[PDB]
């Protein structure tokens, strides 16, 4: 139900989207927030060059990308959807909403929820083995 909705949102990236969520029992505002966050991210992906270019840049995550991830998990979790299912669904293996793997989505959601990272741009970054002294 929610998985089918998120697909149609990604396709656009206006009025029609709110109607799709309401039919499937999804809050129009929360759906509206996702559409703005996705379009801002996809525009932001082009603001950093190309999708392939962004993936090879030293920037691992975007604040807008991180905003969109936490937004997507929240709305999907309210539908009794498992974390791993959301990870695969939003990843490259399914809806290709994020240029990330399921392991990457679930790990970063874990990092966000356990406050291991803030919602900012994230970059990609005579002695023994025992320690005693060998005479």
């Amino acid at each position: 139900e929610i998985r089918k909705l998120l697909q149609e949102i990604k396709k656009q990236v206006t009025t029609e989207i709110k109607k799709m969520a309401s039919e499937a029992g999804i809050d129009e505002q929360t759906a509206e927030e996702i559409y703005h966050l996705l379009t801002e991210f996809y525009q932001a992906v082009e603001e950093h060059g190309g999708i392939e270019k962004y993936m090879h840049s030293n920037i691992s995550w975007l604040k807008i990308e991180l905003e969109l991830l936490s937004a997507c998990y929240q709305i999907a979790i309210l539908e009794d959807m498992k974390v791993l299912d959301i990870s695969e669904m939003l990843s490259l293996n399914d809806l290709r909403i994020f240029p990330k793997t399921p392991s990457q989505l679930q790990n970063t959601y874990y990092k966000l929820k356990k406050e291991l990272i803030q919602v900012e741009d994230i970059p990609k970054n005579k002695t023994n083995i025992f320690g005693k002294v060998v005479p």
């Binding site: 974390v83 791993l84 990870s87 990330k100 793997t101 399921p102 392991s103 990457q104 679930q106 790990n107 874990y110 990092k111 291991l116 005579k126 002695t127 023994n128 083995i129 025992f130 320690g131 005693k132 060998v134």
Partner: protein, 404 residues
């Protein structure tokens, strides 16, 4: 949906894997798994690349999926054993490494049923039977399952058992062979007798044939010459393009490659030739002080851990090898020294940042930070499913008790 493309992509995936460009190779596979999901040769390669890269649980998942998958109707395109023999052979190899001897025998047996001529599974089953059973019982097994299909097959088996030190099994094997050329039999009898610490007497022709038939190598000749100086080993060794090994070990000659020195030492350790091995160890001074790290690994490999420890204790940590870390981590964990073990596992992550085993050791050891240790591993291995399954276990249990 054309077979030339599927095979073209495979030539590429295989070419990259052979050049050890595994990440590029796995990229080709994952692309193939999307376009041609029925071709099992692609998943079978992911499993093999994952195996050598020490992600055994992810490899197990794929091999298990290759046998009897309900979701995909795997139809091979060139390797028709991709869904039969090869998954069994690898699952048996992994389960052996995992010390699940019962599961290893089950798959090894099945793999042998599929292809009965693979010296790989036979060598492994024979060694696995050595864990429990006696040589006469093992030979009964091999005869029962028709291991020795021909004389050449038995000799190829014999080169394996003689190097492992299986004196009685080798004796059973060679005696069951029919009409063996006498030089071949003499070389085998001498090799079996050397395992038994019997004075070695071998004819010049038997040595010469034994080298050519790849039943005798330079280590064998050096051991024999050390045990019996009356043997004509120098003339044979000089002509065999290994004269330097003879000169170094016996004639105070110049240094040989570290690989060759350790070759002779390994055979000595493997055959239980303690007198010869000590003598060889006396020659290590001419090598760099780093040579002791390799000797340490050698001793650890053959389960002389106390002797291996004594070498590791005197090696600069900069020169301790990646296997050495893995040996040391395993040793300390068995000695209930988790603090020092974790320190080495952590060290492995810093030096060998791409080796899956070190991150896994930290996860196993650092129980207090397990969830964090798992997350760190995923950062380095973003396509590994085992890590993702591990985090969900901890994450679901925490999130259920905390939220309710």
């Amino acid at each position: 949906h054309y077979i030339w493309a599927k095979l073209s992509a495979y030539h590429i995936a295989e070419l990259l894997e052979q050049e050890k460009r595994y990440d590029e190779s796995l990229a080709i596979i994952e692309e193939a798994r999307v376009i041609w999901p029925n071709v099992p040769e692609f998943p079978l390669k992911k499993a093999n690349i994952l195996y050598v890269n020490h992600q055994l649980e992810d490899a197990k998942e794929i091999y298990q999926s290759l046998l009897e998958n309900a979701a995909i109707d795997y139809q091979p395109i060139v390797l028709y054993e991709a869904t039969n023999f090869m998954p069994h052979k690898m699952l048996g190899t992994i389960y052996l490494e995992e010390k699940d001897y019962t599961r290893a025998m089950t798959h090894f047996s099945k793999a042998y049923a599929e292809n009965s001529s693979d010296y790989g599974v036979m060598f492994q089953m024979i060694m696995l039977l050595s864990k429990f059973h006696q040589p006469k019982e093992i030979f009964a097994f091999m005869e029962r399952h028709h291991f020795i299909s021909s004389t050449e097959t038995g000799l190829r088996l014999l080169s394996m058992t003689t190097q492992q030190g299986y004196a009685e099994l080798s004796e059973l094997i060679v005696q069951s062979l029919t009409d063996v050329y006498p030089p071949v039999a003499e070389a085998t009898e001498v090799k079996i007798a050397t395992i038994r610490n019997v004075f070695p007497v071998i004819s010049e022709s038997a040595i010469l044939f034994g080298i050519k038939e790849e039943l005798i190598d330079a280590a064998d000749l050096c051991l024999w010459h050390y045990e019996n100086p009356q043997l004509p080993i120098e003339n044979v060794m000089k002509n065999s393009d290994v004269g330097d090994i003879y000169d170094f070990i016996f004639e105070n000659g110049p240094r040989i490659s570290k690989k060759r020195y350790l070759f002779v030492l390994e055979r000595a350790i493997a055959l239980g030739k303690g007198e010869f091995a000590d003598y060889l160890l006396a020659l290590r001074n001419v090598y760099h002080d780093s040579i002791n790290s390799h000797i340490a690994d050698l001793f650890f490999q053959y389960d002389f851990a106390d002797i291996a420890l004594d070498f590791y204790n005197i090696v600069d940590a900069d020169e301790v090898t990646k296997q050495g870390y893995i040996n040391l981590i395993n040793y300390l964990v068995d000695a209930d020294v988790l603090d020092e073990a974790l320190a080495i596992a952590e060290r492995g992550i810093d030096n060998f940042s791409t080796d899956f085993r070190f991150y896994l050791w930290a996860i196993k050891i650092d129980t207090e930070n397990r969830a964090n240790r798992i997350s760190e591993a995923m950062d380095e291995f973003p396509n590994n499913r085992y890590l993702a399954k591990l985090l969900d276990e901890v994450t679901m249990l925490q999130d259920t008790v905390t939220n309710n």
